[PDB]
């Protein structure tokens, strides 16, 4: 995971600073370490180690346990640092499913890490004031009504809570309070009667104290997997079948695990009732749809039942295998061309094959077939087998069977995606560093135009910035801005490949 350590170094250096990313990188790299050896093996002062560990544990980036003799051994989560990259997709999906208030709630959560309900609704009511005008203030109640709608839908959950020390070992305090996660009060919101209005930033005792809220990222990953399978069905069969699949996943939302090989079975009688009322459909056509999606060899659905008429399940691991296989063939198609993607799908479906068989099946000649075979061997997409005749394992006396294994190639593709995003972040930071002088000069001139713009802004000063020598390099500023915008957009859009690969590698594992 050297690519993961490099990417986590870049993300911590961007979103927290330098003398915190040293601590984060060391905790990712070596592992469980007590507090004094984080100080000694890095070389920084102890107070900076304390501030860095507190700002990491605030955002739920490092965990801590209690061990023998009373030591506190910290430990960073590499996956939680990597999920800092998907924050604009989280803020966009909460703006999609909800209002701007639900956008700003998840924004304040992902930015502060842990907040109470009162603090986050105060900050949302404060920040909605700039979005409004003409005397209308935002109030706490309608923000809280969206906050409880998020808490009901489980996008937002409560942090693991402190134990009651009057009931749990009264006496001397332990070195660490030993937080425990309670399954009960995750989504039980504390009631609030305190209402108020947001300040307009003029520049001229807490009931839910200790109850902190964090964004539940696993629910966002479940919603993203839902949208992935829904768009897969929407691109294969039809829009109505896609809406039926969306309805089945919506009914499968609150009733199953985020990591389960098969979800709850659904009776078609309640699939019919759960559809939004805009569709003119019958029971029999719905039965046809379900039994023709069960006819699919991609098998997104399974029968798994006979009682109650139409009993239907949706598949999770087979659907994620189909999506990961589509990603793995899409990258081969775009890297080598269509005639090589043909060979990749051929070696995929026929599970084992030889060269003459590829040349016969694929309608691709010699010196162009084997060329693409060997290019895909040099990139770890396609494994050999070498069934041996003798135990000498000599190449002269054996048969070589091409083989595509989806798991190792998906891990390889994930390893390439991490290093890809790391390289894009490198290029963005290099361009900003080499043009920071013109950047700060532009900051100066926009601070000049910004000051007294509302009052007494003569038109002559607008020409005096254009008369200034920044105007030959406004071409360079536009080039820098479009380059930074394209690199940030690509840094966003590689995460769609990362999530579809990471879901498959996550679901093929048992953790026993």
């Amino acid at each position: 995971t050297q690519a993961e350590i490099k990417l986590c170094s870049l993300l911590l250096q961007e979103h927290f600073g330098e003398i915190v990313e040293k601590i984060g990188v060391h905790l990712i790299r070596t592992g469980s370490q007590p507090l004094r050896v984080i100080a000694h093996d890095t070389g920084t002062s102890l107070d900076q180690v304390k501030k860095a560990l507190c700002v990491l544990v605030q955002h739920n980036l490092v965990s801590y346990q209690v061990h023998k003799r009373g030591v506190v051994e910290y430990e960073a989560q590499c996956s939680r640092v990597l999920r800092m990259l998907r924050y604009p997709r989280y803020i966009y999906t909460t703006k999609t499913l909800y209002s701007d208030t639900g956008e700003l709630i998840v924004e304040e959560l992902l930015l502060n890490g842990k907040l109470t309900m009162s603090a986050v609704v105060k900050k949302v009511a404060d920040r909605l004031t700039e979005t409004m005008e003409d005397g209308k203030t935002m109030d706490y109640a309608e923000v809280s009504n969206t906050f409880v709608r998020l808490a009901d839908t489980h996008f937002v959950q409560r942090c693991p809570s402190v134990p009651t020390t009057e009931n749990s070992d009264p006496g001397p305090p332990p070195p660490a309070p030993t937080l425990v996660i309670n399954e009960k009060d995750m989504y039980l919101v504390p009631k609030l009667s305190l209402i108020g209005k947001g300040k307009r930033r003029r520049s001229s005792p807490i009931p839910d104290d200790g109850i902190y809220w964090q964004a539940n990222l696993d629910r966002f990953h479940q919603h993203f997997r839902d949208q992935a399978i829904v768009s897969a069905v929407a691109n294969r069969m039809d829009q109505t079948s896609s809406e039926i699949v969306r309805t089945m996943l919506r009914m499968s939302e609150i009733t199953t695990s985020s990591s389960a090989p098969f979800t709850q079975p659904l009776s078609s009688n309640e699939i019919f009732r759960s559809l939004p009322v805009g569709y003119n459909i019958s029971k029999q056509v719905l039965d046809q749809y379900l039994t023709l999606l069960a006819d699919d060899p991609l098998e997104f659905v399974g029968k798994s039942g006979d009682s109650g008429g139409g009993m239907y399940v949706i598949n999770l691991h087979k659907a994620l295998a189909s999506l990961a296989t589509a990603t793995l063939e899409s990258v081969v198609q775009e890297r080598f061309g269509s005639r090589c993607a043909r060979i990749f799908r051929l070696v995929l479906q026929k599970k084992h094959i030889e060269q003459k068989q590829v040349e016969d099946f694929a309608m691709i000649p010699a010196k162009e077939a084997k060329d693409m075979l060997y290019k895909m061997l040099s990139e770890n997409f396609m494994s050999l087998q070498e069934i041996p005749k003798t135990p000498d394992h000599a190449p002269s006396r054996t048969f070589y069977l091409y083989t595509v294994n989806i798991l190792s190639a998906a891990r390889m593709l994930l390893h390439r995606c991490y290093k890809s995003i790391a390289n894009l972040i490198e290029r963005r930071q290099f361009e900003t560093k080499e043009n920071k002088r013109l950047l700060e000069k532009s900051q100066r001139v926009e601070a000049i135009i910004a000051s007294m713009q509302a009052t007494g802004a003569e038109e002559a000063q607008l020409q005096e910035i254009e008369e200034m020598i920044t105007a030959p390099e406004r071409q360079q500023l536009e080039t820098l801005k479009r380059n930074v915008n394209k690199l940030d957009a690509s840094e966003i859009q590689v995460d769609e490949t990362i999530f579809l690969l990471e879901s498959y590698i996550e679901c093929t594992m048992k953790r026993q």
Partner: protein, 513 residues
């Protein structure tokens, strides 16, 4: 205008942290990329090519042609490296016994190490104590490989991990799909029936599909070793500051400079092996386009691995019979080991000059701290006496006597000039008038120079002492017979070595101690 460069910093060397380079630091070390295969050009000029081996941007190996971006010579140039880009990765024949061990300790699927969290917490804490030596790390690697080889299932991904063992010269096999006489597991049952299209168009697959397992080639173990998390690397007992697990598979290869492989030995064996590695790289790069079979590709790849393995070590055991060398060549190990290698041959005891060897014969008329050096040896052995104020008038006479009369000199060196004017030619009375303070005159060995004196099987520390020499006409070293008891000399044709120290600190330490 001119950049401040000075290096007379006078640090001494302290300790030598061994390690290994990644393939992408070899690119940062080397100067040229060796891609060509012919040594010298075609014509009569006999000059080497521009991007092959024997390129003189890798230093020089002859007095004629200097190092080709400066104008300074063979005697000063360290030599410089070039790198060969291998087309397909190969195992290193030295690190292969460690590649097997790393593969036996980690999961072959998710690339974590197969241990419980508690045993990792045990061994990582045992790696924290001070005073951890190399004996202790050698024990701890076996104690962790034992608890890794007793597990068959992964505690992290859940997949199965069979035994990994060496199945010959530079091949690694992994038994993932072992069978039993019991109820067949699903994970082996799917793999046994996955051979459908191979069974359809071939007959002999069907008996041989029981012996099929996972073949680990460098294309796969280089892929695996890139995914080992850096938390799990010290449990493989590697210091991650001195090496990485990805570095044990070579995919780029340094070539030694010309001062390590002399072009007139014609060419050294390492130059031939590097030429053959470049040739096999071109052969595979052409057969990836010309559509040769997998038999020819894998055979050539095996050759690429066998040539690198013979490049590093030319005494392998399990060499296949159609691929062995015809002649015996010095690899790097065979120019390290042996009786005439680097260590035992050149580091431990090395030959010295300013020495002599003559038969001894007795002479009691000398004092006990004098040895009588013959004239025909004292005209050859010289001591460099720097000119100063006390002995200018002595060294003018010893320059005027030349190299043939005995109290004379053989050379002369100017102050800030390192060239030695040999003192036979030139009107020597002109060179005797041009002596400045600080010139170095290599005078003959005269009466009173400290010289060392040694009988060859050196039992105790008085087998080598220092006498004050005196020159005498006959051809034997003549010392007093009272000194025969330390040397255990016997005057029956015995020879005793002479050593003349060349530095005033060496004279004084010899004379006092």
């Amino acid at each position: 205008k001119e950049q401040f460069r000075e290096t007379d910093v006078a640090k001494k060397i302290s300790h030598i942290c061994f390690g290994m380079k990644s393939p992408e630091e070899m690119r940062q070390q080397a100067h040229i990329q060796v891609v060509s295969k012919n040594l010298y050009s075609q014509d009569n000029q006999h000059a080497p090519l521009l991007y092959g081996v024997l390129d003189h941007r890798m230093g020089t190996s002859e007095k004629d042609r200097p190092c080709e971006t400066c104008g300074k010579n063979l005697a000063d140039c360290l030599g410089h490296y070039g790198y060969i880009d291998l087309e397909l990765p190969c195992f290193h024949v030295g690190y292969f016994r460690a590649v097997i061990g790393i593969l036996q300790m980690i999961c072959k699927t998710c690339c974590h190490i197969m241990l419980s969290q508690e045993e990792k917490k045990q061994f990582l804490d045992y790696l924290k104590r001070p005073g951890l030596t190399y004996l202790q790390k050698r024990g701890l690697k076996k104690k962790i490989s034992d608890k890794c080889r007793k597990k068959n299932i992964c505690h992290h991904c859940g997949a199965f991990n069979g035994t990994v063992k060496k199945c010959g010269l530079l091949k690694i096999i992994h038994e993932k799909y072992k069978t039993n006489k019991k109820v067949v597991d699903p994970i082996v049952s799917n793999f046994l029936q996955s051979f459908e299209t191979a069974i359809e168009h071939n007959k002999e697959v069907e008996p041989l599909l029981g012996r099929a397992q996972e073949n680990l080639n460098p294309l796969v173990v280089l892929n695996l070793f890139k995914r080992i998390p850096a938390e799990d690397v010290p449990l493989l007992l590697m210091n991650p500051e001195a090496g990485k697990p990805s570095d044990l598979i070579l995919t780029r290869l340094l070539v030694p400079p010309l001062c390590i492989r002399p072009s007139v030995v014609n060419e050294d064996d390492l130059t031939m092996k590097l030429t053959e590695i470049i040739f096999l790289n071109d052969v595979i790069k052409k057969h990836r386009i010309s559509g040769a079979k997998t038999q020819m590709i894998m055979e050539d790849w095996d050759f690429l691995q066998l040539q690198c393995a013979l490049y590093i070590n030319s005494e392998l055991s399990g060499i296949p019979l159609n691929m062995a060398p015809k002649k015996w060549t010095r690899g790097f190990v065979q120019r390290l080991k042996g009786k005439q290698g680097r260590f035992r041959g050149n580091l431990s005891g090395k030959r010295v000059d300013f020495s002599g060897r003559t038969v001894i014969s007795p002479d009691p008329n000398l004092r006990i701290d004098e040895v009588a050096v013959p004239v025909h040896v004292a005209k050859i052995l010289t001591f460099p006496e720097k000119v100063n104020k006390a002995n200018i008038n002595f060294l003018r006479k010893l320059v005027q006597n030349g190299p043939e009369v005995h109290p004379g000199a053989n050379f002369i060196q100017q102050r800030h000039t390192q060239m030695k004017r040999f003192l036979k030619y030139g009107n020597r009375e002109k060179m005797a008038q041009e002596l400045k303070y600080g010139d170095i005159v290599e005078r003959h060995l005269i009466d009173g120079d400290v010289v060392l004196f040694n009988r060859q099987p050196s039992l105790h520390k008085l087998s080598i002492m220092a006498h004050l020499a005196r020159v005498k006409p006959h051809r034997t070293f003549r010392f007093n017979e009272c000194v025969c008891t330390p040397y255990n000399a016997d005057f029956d044709g015995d020879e005793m070595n002479l050593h003349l120290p060349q530095t005033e600190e060496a004279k004084a330490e010899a004379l006092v101690l």
